[PDB]
Amino acid sequence: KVFGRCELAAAMKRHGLDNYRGYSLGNWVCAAKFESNFNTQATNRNTDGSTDYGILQINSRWWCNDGRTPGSRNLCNIPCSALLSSDITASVNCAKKIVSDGNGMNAWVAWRNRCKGTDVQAWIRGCRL
Numbered sequence: 001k002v003f004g005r006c007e008l009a010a011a012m013k014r015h016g017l018d019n020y021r022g023y024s025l026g027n028w029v030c031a032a033k034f035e036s037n038f039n040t041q042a043t044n045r046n047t048d049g050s051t052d053y054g055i056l057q058i059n060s061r062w063w064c065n066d067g068r069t070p071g072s073r074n075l076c077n078i079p080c081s082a083l084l085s086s087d088i089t090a091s092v093n094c095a096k097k098i099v100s101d102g103n104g105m106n107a108w109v110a111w112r113n114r115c116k117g118t119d120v121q122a123w124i125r126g127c128r129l
């Protein structure tokens with residue numbers, strides 16, 4: 001599923017991401033734009049053999065199982081395929097654990113490089129939340 005900007009903001013709000021760990025909604029929407037261009041089926045292989053999945057490009061190195069990342073962990077206890085669904089529950093719940101792991105949203109390299117410190121409220125401006 002390819003979400004529209006406001007559709008995803010609303011979805012994320014219902015799922016408890018607004019101000020989760022102090023991160024306002026616009027931060028999560030900005031991150032999803034640059035990680036996946038709002039595409040739930042996005043996947044990208046890393047040079048280390050792990051794979052990023054879903055609208056927030058969660059890495060099989062630590063967070064989900066895909067059966068082909070030797071020596072990896074599965075800290076969200078989910079198949080990585082669950083991160084590709086039109087329904088964002090699995091991605092949101094895993095994101096919550098990730099953002100609570102000590103480094104906040106810096107875990108998302110694209111967030112740190114493209115969203116952090118910017119006017120993130122612009123990503124939700126005009127949206128009926």
Ligand SMILES: [Cl-]
Pocket residue numbers: 021022103104105
């Ligand atoms: Cl933080």
Ligand SMILES: [Mn+2]
Pocket residue numbers: 011014015087088089
């Ligand atoms: Mn939902």
Ligand code: NA
Pocket residue numbers: 060061062063064065066069072073074
């Ligand atoms: Na894994």
